[PDB]
Design a protein around this ligand. Sequence first.
Ligand SMILES: CCCCCCCCCCCCCCCCCC(=O)OC[C@H](COP(=O)([O-])OCC(O)COP(=O)([O-])OC[C@@H](COC(=O)CCCCCCCCCCCCCCCCC)OC(=O)CCCCCCCCCCCCCCCCC)OC(=O)CCCCCCCCCCCCCCCCC
Ligand SMILES: CCCCCCCCCCCCCCCCCC(=O)OC[C@H](COP(=O)([O-])OCC[N+](C)(C)C)OC(=O)CCCCCCCCCCCCCCCCC
Ligand SMILES: CCCCCCCCCCCCCCCCCC(=O)OC[C@H](COP(=O)([O-])OCC[N+](C)(C)C)OC(=O)CCCCCCCCCCCCCCCCC
Ligand SMILES: Nc1ncnc2c1ncn2[C@@H]1O[C@H](COP(=O)(O)OP(=O)(O)OP(=O)(O)O)[C@@H](O)[C@H]1O
Ligand SMILES: [Mg+2]
Lengths: 231, 105, 35, 110, 256, 96, 108
Amino acid sequence: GYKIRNKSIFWTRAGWKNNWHPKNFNAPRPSYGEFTMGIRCRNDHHSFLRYVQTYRNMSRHCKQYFLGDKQLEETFILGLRSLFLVPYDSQCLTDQIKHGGERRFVDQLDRDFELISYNTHPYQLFTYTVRNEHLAWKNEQYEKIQKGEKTFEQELLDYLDEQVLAEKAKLRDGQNFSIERMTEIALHVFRKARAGKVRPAQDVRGPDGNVNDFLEQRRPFEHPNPTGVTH
Amino acid sequence: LQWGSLAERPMVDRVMSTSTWPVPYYQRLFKAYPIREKKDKMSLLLSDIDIDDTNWYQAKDFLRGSFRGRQIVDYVENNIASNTYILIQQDVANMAKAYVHDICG
Amino acid sequence: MKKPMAKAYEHPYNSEHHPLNFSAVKIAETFHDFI
Amino acid sequence: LDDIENELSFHAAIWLNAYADYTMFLFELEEYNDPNDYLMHENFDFFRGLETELEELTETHNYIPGAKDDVNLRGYLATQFAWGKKVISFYRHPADDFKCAKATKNMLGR
Amino acid sequence: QMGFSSDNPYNKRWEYKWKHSYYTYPRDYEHTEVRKPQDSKDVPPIYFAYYKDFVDRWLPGMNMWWQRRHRIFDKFNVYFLPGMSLFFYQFADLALGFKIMAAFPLFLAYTRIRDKTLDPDFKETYLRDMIYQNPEITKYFNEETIHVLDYEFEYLPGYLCPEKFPEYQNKTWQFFNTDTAQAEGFFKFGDVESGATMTLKFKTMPIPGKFRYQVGEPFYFYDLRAEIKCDGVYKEVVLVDEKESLKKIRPFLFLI
Amino acid sequence: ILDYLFLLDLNDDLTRKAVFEQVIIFIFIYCTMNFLAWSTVVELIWPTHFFNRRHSSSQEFIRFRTYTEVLLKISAYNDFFYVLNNYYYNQKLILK
Amino acid sequence: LTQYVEGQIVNRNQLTLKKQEDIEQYVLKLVRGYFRTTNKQGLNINSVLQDHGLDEFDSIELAMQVEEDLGYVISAETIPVLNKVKHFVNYINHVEQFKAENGKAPIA
Ligand SMILES: CCCCCCCCCCCCCCCCCC(=O)OC[C@H](COP(=O)([O-])OCC(O)COP(=O)([O-])OC[C@@H](COC(=O)CCCCCCCCCCCCCCCCC)OC(=O)CCCCCCCCCCCCCCCCC)OC(=O)CCCCCCCCCCCCCCCCC
Ligand SMILES: CCCCCCCCCCCCCCCCCC(=O)OC[C@H](COP(=O)([O-])OCC[N+](C)(C)C)OC(=O)CCCCCCCCCCCCCCCCC
Ligand SMILES: CCCCCCCCCCCCCCCCCC(=O)OC[C@H](COP(=O)([O-])OCC[N+](C)(C)C)OC(=O)CCCCCCCCCCCCCCCCC
Ligand SMILES: Nc1ncnc2c1ncn2[C@@H]1O[C@H](COP(=O)(O)OP(=O)(O)OP(=O)(O)O)[C@@H](O)[C@H]1O
Ligand SMILES: [Mg+2]
């Protein structure tokens, strides 16, 4: 498609693709015991234990609002680990960060936990919204099954199972029903089923099989254009 | 439920329109988005992520929906000496040696 | 099929029209509703 | 034999799940066209989850662009001809300050 | 005993050391288990951030001063510094220099109180480097498998026995100091790999080093003992014996 | 009742200083200026975030899944994704 | 004392082991119950958690579950040394011995 042509795109004054120690004038310089009277420094060796406690806090304080959903707790753990494994897997040399990458990431996670303790972190609100929509769709499938009715997902699977039998009963020269062939069969059914949601299937024509739907249409009288002029 | 013809495509793809003179001068700037609703569509961020823990976790979720799948999940998590659920086959050592121990009979 | 959970947690101070947290996305929607 | 029959089954189920991920993305990508002709909030709806990550940056006051991105490609494109060409350091918060100060036998801390 | 202590249940020996990047304090203290949504109070009340800073920063700081209030009751802090401040306060309206000479002994008193009321902190990395060099300890303990069961370290009150430490029977030193600046404590350790436990008792004191006026080490272990307990073996390791240590070095006798 | 409440007076402010009426004009201007400046800085992190999260990936490196991408794959899949996986599993793992 | 379990409020019960055979059975059931643990039947007393798909962060989740079942308050300094099944068994023994000798919980 399109590639960056500038060969010097990742060059910095500190080297190639260096986002851990950008070059500045006030560079770090060593200290000597014999010659140093006093010092004001905030660096310590408390980041490791703060990294462990922050995980326990962020994990436990978030499970307070999971209502015991076991599958949500395990999903959250996988997501929480992806946030803590950033310094270990990134291309950036996190052990070479300017003034200590360990302290920087620990203080960054503390700001996240502060929002977590108040149940106002955007990851939390996003989890509640996503899970509610998922449970509403699972409850819809459950209520249809209790009524003995067939779900829309089960009808697709049974329809896909019968199309495979039809395509393989004519495939005698070759006998490799590859995953590529299976996929394009399911995708073709999906495109017709997706278009069928906005225009349902009334007759044998099937989902979205009416040409009259695409003739000239007008807004209903009880719902005109609310935002702009029509003429 | 009706499915129509598998050989045909949706009617949206088959409907067409042609132009004529005169033609409206106006050039559309943006696509209209009057109502902020994009339900039932998966996020396009899920594009080119490599294999990871979410793959074997969601595999068990869908496998446990079947009888045969429940047997596979319980057997793998109990009777397979692997230090990870991200199974990667780069050799046929365990495959070939499992065949020579069975084809003798 | 096991009976799923009825509902997840519902935040008492987050709505779609009055989102609790701020971003340029919500300001963009209110902006294009205005113009 | 039944040990590898169930091992290769779960192994295939993992990579079939990854195959379905890539397939369903290309399927959803058909409804996405002209990324330059969408509104700001509609483009973020296609890429659901980007608004949430943008809110986390704002609420934690990480308003330095590209600080939590491993490859701030946008930062490199903006500084191709910048004086003192540099990008922001990884996970740099605008409020942190690691400045030190020492007193030695010489003046100015030397 | 740790002087700085909040209602937070975790990491009591690190509470004063850890510097969080929090803008304000968390809504609740660190949970000891998963709780219910109705256990915590949504939208904490108004002026919650000001209340938390008083009970998590102000109040435990005053309890630290109160716990060790006996170390600041010297004739220098009690009579001399306030007496000097009152002498110049009577002429505070005559010139600006009297206001400064009346406030300096107050700031000097605060600094002595601030430093003397802090928790006694030894160089723990020197200590762990010392116990991991002993072969009898490394047989049952290692840094990767050791865990802390109990920690105690506190200053010793008053002047000690005036035969083991004749240094503190000094009227000039007693004018500035009411305690001996020595501390005593122990360390309850355990090894999850070998199943052994030990009580690392220690006594510290400030010593002079290499220079005329500056203290060399404010917490020098002049007595260091380990009572190692195993499955069926009880060993007693003596890293630093006080009978051999007190014959070579003597305390420092801080002034001011 | 105390005389500290006299600071609420603006009828007779010309009798004491008459400075309050002019200083707040600057403060209102100063707030308007910082509003235009700060909102521009904080809001304009989105073009960088939108571009990097969609164009910064490469094939010689591993793209790791974020928190949101974990929740969307596991708890926000649609019906077509659920069918395609069970369709693959039934045809290949069960029906061979 | 009560917690939500699948949307239902269920009273949480606490265990008191006070026996070597019961501690080993609890830790094995604890580690096997974790959803990231691989080769659950190959797990024994001398099993390294790394060999079963567990890292430093999984030990925190396991230690968090020990506090739920036993009522312990485990400090952040102790968690990073629990890397084997034997380490959990010895730590639980040391906590029970400490409370039986000192009459109080270890420092948290
Ligand atoms: C209407 C509602 C509102 C009303 C508001 C107004 C009301 C306010 C009320 C205030 C009064 C109550 C508060 C105090 C109650 C404490 C009672 C008590 O029992 O405590 C004992 C308690 C002992 O506890 P313990 O361990 O159980 O005792 C065991 C043994 O008994 C221990 O045995 P020991 O042998 O070790 O003895 C230990 C003991 C020893 O105690 C003593 O021996 C007494 C010594 C007191 C000396 C005071 C004079 C110093 C100067 C004298 C110099 C004379 C010689 C030179 C003369 C030169 C003349 C120029 O140590 C002390 O307790 C003394 C601590 C420091 C006191 C001196 C502070 C000096 C302040 C100077 C300014 C004074 C302004 C007053 C206000 C007037 C103007 C408005 O000690 C404390 O709790 C200390 C509390 C904290 C110190 C409070 C002192 C004030 C600090 C505030 C700083 C600002 C001061 C004011 C500055 C203003 C101008 C800038
Ligand atoms: C008008 C709308 C609002 C605008 C607000 C202001 C916008 C500012 C836009 C960014 C400009 C900032 C300039 C900073 C220096 C950039 C150049 C550089 O990094 O030096 C590298 C330079 C340039 O090296 P170079 O390699 O990058 O470029 C060399 C040029 N060529 C390529 C042509 C050879 O190298 C140095 O080492 C020189 C160091 C001198 C540094 C002087 C900095 C002084 C100012 C910084 C402190 C200012 C504090 C102000 C805060 C006040 C707080 C109250
Ligand atoms: C003469 C009459 C009284 C005179 C007025 C006295 C007013 C004193 C209070 C106002 C000044 C407070 C200074 C604010 C700036 C420092 C904030 C601070 O204290 O941080 C605590 C700090 C906290 O430590 P820190 O700030 O270094 O941080 C802690 C470290 N981390 C974050 C890692 C946990 O502690 C101290 O400084 C030591 C205790 C200081 C005590 C402060 C004054 C208490 C005075 C008690 C008077 C009680 C009688 C009056 C009231 C009676 C009821 C009506
Ligand atoms: N080599 C150093 N260089 C620069 N600053 C330092 C250095 N050592 C300490 N500092 C600063 O002085 C503070 C006190 O150091 P100190 O050794 O007492 O900490 P510590 O946690 O008690 O160590 P330990 O666990 O060994 O007892 C430190 O928090 C640090 O900010
Ligand atoms: Mg120390």
